[PDB]
Structure formats: structure tokens, C-alpha cells
Ligand binder design. Structure first.
Ligand SMILES: Nc1ncnc2c1ncn2[C@@H]1O[C@H](COP(=O)(O)OP(=O)(O)OP(=O)(O)O)[C@@H](O)[C@H]1O
Ligand SMILES: N#CCc1n[nH]c2cc(Cl)c(Br)cc12
Length: 327
């Protein structure tokens, strides 16, 4: 069967913490007062929650309330425990309260409000300096949660909020995050299509923090090359084909050979044979202002099939691409 894998960093952080840290089902939720929050307007709804802008009437501060749908309310202790474990960490969204919604009769998570800059505006306006600055800020959040024994598993632009005026970044939506335990087989149905790592796409379950580093690479490639998304799959199968057209099929087959993976036979008729393309293939007049040799080298070290080969968040922070960023 498949060859096992473990992370190369923060491998046993969970074994060395009291069980209460990661045994989220044993956690006793401390409930706040729902009357402290007045709903103002609905911001959105997904298959898992409804999100509202609200006011905390005890301090007249804006907050965001995420009301869990009856379906997603089951794994709520995992999201709660992760948010409480990470609270106060670098660029981690703050969970302000947990209340029982009077209408849905489900848990409602109350978060720090971010006056975030529009995501399309961020995509279209961030300069070369800004991309480096904000990539360094998201790396601080990722290294912190990985060092705390947690994988986010849903890194994408909409989950990395930026309030551009205050040069403030927050990593949000921890509903898919999980505790990393060496040897654990995880569900591959995580992350959003364009940000799924090859490990998910080839159905390799023994993945780790390094999944988040692939997703971060996908964000970086889209930003510097002005291509949204960078790997534009029609579905989860075509997603792997899109990747293979850039990274090549030989390194893909070496990856599945190494891990002794049984690749879905549906790929035999669609992967084809592709060589790796040099990153300069994607440079053009409209993105050259965002591209540098250091950006290409950094990207090259994130977007690797072999999850064990990718830079860790702490190694990424050491890269020359960040030397120009004021620290
Ligand atoms: N802490 C927060 N501060 C301010 N706005 C927030 C906060 N958390 C979430 N939001 C916003 O709430 C809105 C609704 O949330 P939701 O997750 O449904 O949307 P989304 O991010 O556009 O979804 P998707 O994951 O499909 O891209 C979004 O505009 C999101 O940016
Ligand atoms: N794509 C896109 C826009 C965008 N949304 N959120 C971001 C976070 C960072 Cl770190 C960077 Br760089 C860019 C974005």
C-alpha cells in the first residue's frame, strides 16, 4: 500500500501537550451572552454558516458573527478549540465569544471585525513591495499555527484578509483546520479546488502542514503572474492536469512512485506527457513589475509535488525575496 509520511518540522508538538489541547471533543464550551450582539447586516452564507456584521453593544465595537448551519455544527468543538489555542498568535483572527443563536439554536462564533480591503482591489493594486510585505505577514500566521500543531487546510485569498490602510493581515476561517498527528490519515476533501495540493489530488491521506505551503504558492503565483487562478482546473481531475502542464509529468510520476500511490486510472487518458516549463514562460509585459529572480526562486520552492520537499513557513521567511521588506 502507500508508503507513510510525516512532517519534517513540528512533528510531535501534539504528543507533548496535555490531551486537553488537541482532544477537542472533551472540551467544555464557555458560552457568552447572545444579547451582547446586535445583528446589523448579512455579509454572506456558505454551505457551513451564515456570516453577519454585528455590534457588540457592551463597547459599541463592530464584530462578525458566524452562525453555524445544523450540518456544520457537529465539528464545532474542533474549530473552537483551534481558535482558542491560537488566540493572540501573530495575524490569527481573534475569537471574541461563543454564543447560542436564539433563532437557529446553533453555536454562533463572534470574531474580531476586520475593515478589510476588497479582494479584487487587493489582487489588482498590491505592488511588488506589498506582495512581499503581506506574504511575510501570512507566513508569520502559518508558522505560528504549524508550530502550534495545526494545519489550516483552506489557505486562499478570501481567507487571508487585509486591511490595507493599517497594513494589517488576518488569517480567517478555521472551519477546515485540523490538529496534525504523525501517521494520521486525513480527509483529502479540504481546501478549495484551485489551492488543492497534489497530495489531495492523487488521494494521499497522510499529509501535513506542507499542504498550506502549496496553497500559499498558488496565491503567490496568481499575484505575481497576474493569472487568476494560476492552476485553473475544471474539476479535481483537470486540476492535476493543469498542474502537470506546468511542473511536468515526470516529477509527478516520481512523486507517486516514491509514496507508492495507486493513481486513479481515470488520469491515464487525460494527464498526457508534459515537461516542466521554466517560470519565465509565464512572464509578460503586464506582470513583469511583480516578477524578480527572487520571487521565481521562492515560488519554485513552494510549488513542488513532493510535500516533504517544499519550504516550511519558517524556511520561507528566510528567503531572499523578503530581504527588502522592512522588519
Ligand atoms: N472577521 C471578519 N471581519 C470582516 N469581515 C469578515 C470577517 N470574517 C468574514 N468576513 C466576511 O464575511 C463575508 C461572508 O463570509 P463568507 O465566508 O461566506 O464569504 P467568502 O469569503 O466570500 O466565501 P468563499 O469561502 O466561498 O470565498 C465575506 O465578505 C468575508 O470577507
Ligand atoms: N489574490 C489575491 C488578493 C489577496 N487577497 N488576500 C491576499 C493575501 C495576500 Cl498575502 C496577498 Br500577497 C494577496 C491577497
Amino acid at each position: 500500500g502507500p508508503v507513510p509520511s510525516r512532517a519534517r518540522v513540528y512533528t510531535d508538538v501534539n504528543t507533548h501537550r496535555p490531551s486537553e489541547y488537541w482532544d477537542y471533543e472533551s472540551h467544555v464550551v464557555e458560552w457568552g451572552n447572545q444579547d451582547d450582539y446586535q445583528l446589523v447586516r448579512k455579509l454572506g452564507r456558505g454551505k457551513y454558516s451564515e456570516v453577519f456584521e454585528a455590534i457588540n453593544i457592551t463597547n459599541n465595537e463592530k464584530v462578525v458573527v458566524k452562525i453555524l448551519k445544523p450540518v456544520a455544527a457537529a465539528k464545532i468543538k474542533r474549530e473552537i478549540k483551534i481558535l482558542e489555542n491560537l488566540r493572540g498568535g501573530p495575524n490569527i483572527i481573534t475569537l471574541a465569544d461563543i454564543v447560542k443563536d436564539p433563532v437557529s439554536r446553533t453555536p454562533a462564533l463572534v470574531f474580531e471585525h476586520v475593515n478589510n480591503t476588497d479582494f479584487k482591489q487587493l489582487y489588482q493594486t498590491l505592488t511588488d513591495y506589498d506582495i512581499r510585505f503581506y506574504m511575510y505577514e501570512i507566513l508569520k500566521a502559518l508558522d505560528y499555527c504549524h508550530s502550534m500543531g495545526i494545519m489550516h487546510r483552506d489557505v486562499k485569498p478570501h481567507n487571508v484578509m487585509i486591511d490595507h490602510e493599517h497594513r494589517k493581515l488576518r488569517l480567517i476561517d478555521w472551519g477546515l483546520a485540523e490538529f496534525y498527528h504523525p501517521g494520521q490519515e486525513y480527509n483529502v476533501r479540504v481546501a478549495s479546488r484551485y489551492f488543492k495540493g497534489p497530495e489531495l489530488l492523487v488521494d494521499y491521506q497522510m499529509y501535513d502542514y506542507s499542504l498550506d505551503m502549496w496553497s500559499l504558492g498558488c496565491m503567490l503565483a496568481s499575484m505575481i503572474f497576474r493569472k487568476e487562478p494560476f492552476f485553473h482546473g475544471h474539476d479535481n481531475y483537470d486540476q492535476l492536469v493543469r498542474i502537470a502542464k506546468v511542473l511536468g509529468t515526470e516529477d509527478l510520476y516520481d512523486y507517486i512512485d516514491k509514496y507508492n500511490i495507486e493513481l486513479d486510472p481515470r488520469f491515464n487518458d487525460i494527464l498526457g506527457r508534459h515537461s516542466r516549463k521554466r517560470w519565465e514562460r509565464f512572464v509578460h509585459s503586464e506582470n513583469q513589475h511583480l516578477v524578480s529572480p527572487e520571487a521565481l526562486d521562492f515560488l519554485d520552492k513552494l510549488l513542488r509535488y513532493d510535500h516533504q520537499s517544499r519550504l516550511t513557513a519558517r524556511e520561507a521567511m528566510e528567503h531572499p525575496y523578503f530581504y527588502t521588506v522592512v522588519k
